[PDB]
Design a protein around this ligand. Structure first.
Ligand SMILES: [Mg+2]
Ligand SMILES: [Mg+2]
Ligand SMILES: [Mg+2]
Ligand SMILES: [Mg+2]
Ligand SMILES: [Mg+2]
Ligand SMILES: [Mg+2]
Ligand SMILES: [Mg+2]
Ligand SMILES: [Mg+2]
Lengths: 305, 305, 304, 305
């Protein structure tokens, strides 16, 4: 009885997704395969000064990280592989931040102090941030760093709201902090293809709508695995329903409309720049297709859309 | 063009209505005799050039007023807020004079390397010691906000006549990057009075509306010195006017309305927690009062309200 | 004699009562977590092993209180079950603690150890109600517990001693013994209904709700107290002894009073559908609990 | 609004009729030269701010008259009732000045913790020492009544506009919570004269009507300073007029009639016990007299009766 507000019937959820895909003209990409990413990530893991136990667990985490390469089908190996590596490291964080007790709780200070971290995988995370200039310009590097700091600490703080009714702006704030979207958005515009000194002023207006698309599209497409089929009640859609007193269904529909509006805004902003726009369109189709095709995480074969 | 061009009389009347709506009353003057001597000692201790020290003595006259924003806080909180204010005033005022040093800040910071200019070393050392007055989430947020501020300052004028007409989300995105709001908002809730492990879950829902209040209230109160009296056409209100094809006058009113809504939201969220609410109210009264009293920066003694 | 009520008279009163308030027995409520959590609670108290052994019996009665708050969190349901176990132990065995109860309130505010370990557990519960209530609710649970401990200690002083002209005294004593505010404040738990926003909405319903809680137990426990048992200092008998009326008349008047309060609560909380829903769930399960808990109220011996 | 209007002529006539119907005669003036010095010494001994001690000099002059309510009682009874009156006057007139301190009084009291304000430590100490003049039942009732008074005061501002017209029993509920009556009623029957083991079963049947007399008689006698001379519209009389669709004049008269009825009830219940009844008669005459004589609080020398 108390859970009705957060449930959505399967037929209605499938209809939400069908309307969403119609409205943004989503067309599923052909199946992505990159026989290069998995061996390279295995070699990365082997090279880390990690315990045998962490390397063993990282094999499972790597299976899910490698799908991120499919989001940037045209990008250089450097872009795809680095996006995959940072995804592996934040999956490990999401798994171990409580086990490591207070480790990530000191990540940012130890990072800016140049001090060894309390766990080797956090040293690997520090080194990644130290070498983002391998694939991003300096603005992109800065934002990957600041986004990682937000993610580490927001993940810590998330575990405290297992949400005040009057806090209308809080659900989006929490989702910004833990969604990691800015890191992926910057790889839509890699520094080798779009050097910042010439292109940053052209694509910067699209970064905020892209970050919304990345967060919100995952909220729409992972609501089944999080809340319908799962036990998750403190995600963005449930938080919005709690602070507005609305149903999960109505919040999902508002979020669908928000994504469509961001897509339209990006299509308008980047109309003069066909290559920048093509990178955005390619990302979005690959991103949605990744959610549909990865059934071990999102279970979308169980929904009719 | 007519889009801009807000009259002195129109602007004063809008400010009058704003102060009436939020029931603003100018606080009695705030004075702590320990702040300026401490800040003079800080400046004298920095390995800065003599001209930067003289100029910093000028900027200090503006920075010391920040202590009044936190009247119930410890000296360490008030003084550190004053110091970081001095540093970001220097960065903004003189970021032509540092050359490319700012563009290297984030990577040198996370590599544990010295900065290209000693002024930026002072900034890095501040970030390394934010745990002296904030908890772990607040310290991370000051670090990440400073990275955004340095990079947003660097890119701000790239958009001089280059704001795309339909880029609706961009003005807010740029203002988040340049406004530095999270740094001040977190010191509203110092870790000694409100330790994070007990209070963070209580005040965190208030941080996002507080950041909107900080950003937007400066936009309202500094529109005179930026756009009516000055030549700035790349600030938040002008960016909203150019992205919406609307007048600066109407966008200024829209920003007043947004701040008024945020003040109501904070008052609702923090109602159960009188201490947190009092720190917030003290902050808001003194932040507005600082804009009125610092005539050398905002020239509001020239407007009738 | 003036207190004789036959089985048939009593069952007919209950039948008409249930019809008039449109009572329907809820479907059985079960949370597999409640009974083991209460067993672990008992195991961790530093009570005598004899009291722990005894307390298993009272636990079987206490666990049903979770069904009064079916939409509430485990913290609300479980803490209501714990305080129920403690007050049942007090309600049945207060004489086994000697004069310990008489010093409970002063030892509590002084920070002194209680005269019996069981009362230390009661004090610890009162110190932790912020786990599930706001500040107003926490204060009410404390003040209600002080009243309950003292009303229980003095109740039986009035056997064959209730003075005829004291028409307000039966209600005064029932407020003290009924423990109602503790349960009423849990109907509106602080996580679902943060006090600062909702207390102005539900506080106007507290007075009739406490009347419903006290009086509905008086109606439904009259069989075990006075027909099947020997209790003659309960609310119904006290009213009969101050008014010179039969127990049957006073029982009927109490039923009529409850029906009126039910209409009142429905009027007060009608603009607030979630508050109203928690209230209705509470009342249906409160009555149902009296019917199903045959080991305490024996209502399977009555035809209604 | 005409519904709450009572003229000075009407109010004086109501008081004259009330006094003649209960056979009230202003008691011959009461004086114990020990009480005022003892309260000055109590104030001087508290670890309060000099400002609070200065304000408490004003409140003490209203508190010392409480000793006249118990003219046949020991100094322990009279002085303790004066002290707790001082403390609840400080709480009420000035819980603007204490903030959230009162909101955590009850939990800090039962946890054995220091209170957030020294004044509230004095209140907690009083509650711990009521066995100096009451038996165990009376001590419990003073504690529970103080908790009700503190919380009812803390929430009184929720209905500052009006109470819900639909909640007929709520005006009495509110008045019980904030009237503090049980604390004063139990001192009518002090434990040194009427040991609870023998006397409680004799006077407890009178406590409910006595609490009504205390609450309602103040409502009658403070109506002038609250609603005719002042601007209060959320006291018991006005709340009853709001919930019953009647006028404040009719509700004032009905409250007078209720008090007269309770007085007769008390005389009947305690008729067999002349010393118990005498303590009640002394109390009521001095309670009414206190309202007449404490012109700095009730202004009844501005009324003709
Ligand atoms: Mg998700
Ligand atoms: Mg997740
Ligand atoms: Mg500026
Ligand atoms: Mg500005
Ligand atoms: Mg019983
Ligand atoms: Mg009973
Ligand atoms: Mg008053
Ligand atoms: Mg009064």
């Amino acid at each position: 009885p108390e859970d009705v507000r957060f449930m959505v019937s399967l037929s209605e959820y499938g209809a939400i997704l069908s309307r969403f895909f119609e409205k943004i003209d989503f067309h599923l990409p052909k199946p992505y395969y990159d026989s290069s990413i998995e061996p390279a990530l295995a070699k990365y893991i082997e090279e880390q000064p990690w315990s045998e136990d962490l390397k063993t667990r990282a094999a499972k985490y790597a299976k899910q990280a490698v799908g991120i390469a499919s989001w940037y089908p045209r990008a250089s190996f450097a872009v795809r592989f680095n996006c995959v590596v940072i995804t592996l490291l934040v999956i490990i964080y999401d798994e171990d931040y409580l086990t490591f007790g207070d480790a990530g709780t000191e990540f940012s200070l130890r990072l800016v102090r140049g001090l060894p971290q309390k766990a080797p995988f956090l040293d690997s995370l520090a080194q990644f941030l130290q070498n983002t200039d391998q694939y991003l310009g300096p603005y992109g590097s800065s934002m990957v760093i600041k986004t990682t700091l937000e993610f580490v600490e927001g993940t810590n703080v998330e575990n405290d709201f297992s949400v005040p009714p009057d806090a209308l702006r809080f659900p989006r704030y929490l989702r910004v902090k833990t969604g990691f979207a800015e890191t992926y958005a910057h790889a839509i515009f890699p520094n080798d293809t779009f050097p910042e000194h010439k292109y940053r002023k052209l694509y910067l207006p699209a970064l905020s709508p892209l970050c919304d698309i990345i967060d919100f599209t995952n909220d729409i497409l992972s609501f089944y695995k999080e809340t319908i089929r799962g036990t998750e009640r403190i995600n963005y859609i449930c938080n919005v329903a709690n602070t507005t007193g609305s149903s999960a269904l109505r919040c999902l529909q508002e979020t669908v409309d928000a994504v469509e509006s961001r897509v339209l805004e990006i299509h308008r902003i980047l109309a003069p720049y066909p290559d920048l726009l093509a990178h955005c369109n390619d990302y979005l189709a690959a991103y949605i297709g990744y959610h549909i095709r990865t059934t071990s995480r999102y279970f979308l074969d169980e929904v009719r859309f």
